[PDB]
Amino acid sequence: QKHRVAPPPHVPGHLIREIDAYDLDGLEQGFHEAWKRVQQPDTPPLVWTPFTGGHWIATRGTLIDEIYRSPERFSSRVIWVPREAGEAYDMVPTKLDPPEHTPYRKAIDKGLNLAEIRKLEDQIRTIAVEIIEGFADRGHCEFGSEFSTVFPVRVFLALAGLPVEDATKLGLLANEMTRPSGNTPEEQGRSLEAANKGFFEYVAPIIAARRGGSGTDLITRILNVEIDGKPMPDDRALGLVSLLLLGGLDTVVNFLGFMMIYLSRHPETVAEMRREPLKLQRGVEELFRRFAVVSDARYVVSDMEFHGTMLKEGDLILLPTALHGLDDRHHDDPMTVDLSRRDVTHSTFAQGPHRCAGMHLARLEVTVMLQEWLARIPEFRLKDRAVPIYHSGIVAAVENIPLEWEPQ
Ligand code: HEM
Ligand SMILES: CC1(C)[C@@H]2CC[C@@]1(C)C(=O)C2
Numbered sequence: 001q002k003h004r005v006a007p008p009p010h011v012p013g014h015l016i017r018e019i020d021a022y023d024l025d026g027l028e029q030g031f032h033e034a035w036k037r038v039q040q041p042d043t044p045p046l047v048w049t050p051f052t053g054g055h056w057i058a059t060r061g062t063l064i065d066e067i068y069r070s071p072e073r074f075s076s077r078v079i080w081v082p083r084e085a086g087e088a089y090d091m092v093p094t095k096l097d098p099p100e101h102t103p104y105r106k107a108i109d110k111g112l113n114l115a116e117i118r119k120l121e122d123q124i125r126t127i128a129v130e131i132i133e134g135f136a137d138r139g140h141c142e143f144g145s146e147f148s149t150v151f152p153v154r155v156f157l158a159l160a161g162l163p164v165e166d167a168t169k170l171g172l173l174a175n176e177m178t179r180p181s182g183n184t185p186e187e188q189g190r191s192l193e194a195a196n197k198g199f200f201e202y203v204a205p206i207i208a209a210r211r212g213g214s215g216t217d218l219i220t221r222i223l224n225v226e227i228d229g230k231p232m233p234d235d236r237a238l239g240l241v242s243l244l245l246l247g248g249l250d251t252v253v254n255f256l257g258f259m260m261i262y263l264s265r266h267p268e269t270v271a272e273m274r275r276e277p278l279k280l281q282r283g284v285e286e287l288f289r290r291f292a293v294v295s296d297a298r299y300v301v302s303d304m305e306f307h308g309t310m311l312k313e314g315d316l317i318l319l320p321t322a323l324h325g326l327d328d329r330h331h332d333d334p335m336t337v338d339l340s341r342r343d344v345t346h347s348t349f350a351q352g353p354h355r356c357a358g359m360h361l362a363r364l365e366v367t368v369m370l371q372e373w374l375a376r377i378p379e380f381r382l383k384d385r386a387v388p389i390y391h392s393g394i395v396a397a398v399e400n401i402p403l404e405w406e407p408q
Helices: 031-038 062-069 083-088 101-112 113-116 123-135 143-148 152-158 164-178 184-211 218-223 236-250 251-264 267-275 279-288 359-376
Strands: 048-050 055-060 140-142 293-298 305-306 309-310 316-320 389-391 397-399 403-404
Touching: 031 389, 048 316, 048 359, 062 316, 101 113, 101 218, 101 236, 113 359, 123 143, 123 152, 123 359, 140 143, 143 251, 143 397, 152 164, 152 236, 152 251, 164 184, 164 236, 164 251, 184 218, 184 236, 184 251, 218 236, 236 251, 251 279, 251 397, 267 279, 267 359, 293 397, 309 389
Parallel strands: 055 316
Antiparallel strands: 048 055, 140 403, 293 316, 305 309, 389 397
């Protein structure tokens, strides 16, 4: 039984669509495929679902792009559904609009800018090689538990100066943030609240130990950037360090799983990457277009008409980022990976002032991953009749990816 809410007075019947972001219709065929079902040739640009507390969904890439770019009309004061979860959410600076957002983003960019990220290449490669070597001679692995959930977590915990043994407990908090348990808006709100508190509890001693510290880790570097001529306050520090961990640990893990399932079903594409190493390097952005993972929201600042649709102040609009990169109005044959695609425009990293601060790190992890994978395991396929298990929510997830190959 799905929890359902009545449409408010300003939502007309013809825009209503029953869409469950946390359990998409057709999800067993894939996350991307399930979102694609919503984007039909005649579907309105904005549709309203009675599920997950009642909210709008942007169904086309240009609205998604525009909403992300327009913080004055669509605020980050609530970026989750259901509303209860969005109100419990306390991460920084992702809860803030400009101008409050901008000193915190500048602080993060001190640690995460492209020139900083470039320095990490060989440490990332070393981690990738060590994991791949554990199974490359074997001719099979379950890619999810043996690589995708291992590689990005080891990379991030090392960068953040944290013990790898914390991976499990941080992964559990991350799940309840992005895929909160519950069958009610209030239950999901409560699950997110508990996860968010868990992050704060974990992060507090690290902030206390690393304020003015001399560690060269990511957390010490960012935490000690002044905000408006002063040390960053405790409340903001909790939200900020928690965000670093959430962003570092959930995203690349899930991205890698979707990407790899597709590659394992497209040997011709894998072979191109092998024959032309520059096609691989240059084609990574195409993979980001193709394997979006985030579906999050914005809060309507005032009563307005937007793309022919009446919106009320306080309305939540969900932005399924897959519906930008996979929009057939933005990209021909959008479900196909074309490494030579000249136009890869997407919102996988969102847009506007919150456009992913970790995007350089994400690109490098993936580039390194594919380079070291193809070096040791040039050819591979998904196990015959294997059925990956898919999850939808604010961040998509996938498990059960059994790969097979002839040891080279
Ligand atoms: C597959 C890779 C990734 C994807 C698809 C992704 C996606 C996104 C998206 C969509 C946003 C915008 C959220 C919003 O305002 O609604 C975001 C922001 C952010 N991400 Fe990433 N992310 C990824 C990797 C990472 C990594 C590895 C980090 C490292 C910690 C990271 C750190 C951040 C931070 C700190 C923000 C907030 C930026 C701000 O508010 O100015 N992300 N990410
Ligand atoms: C949606 C995100 C990927 C972005 C960074 C981590 C994440 C889950 C957030 O809370 C904001």
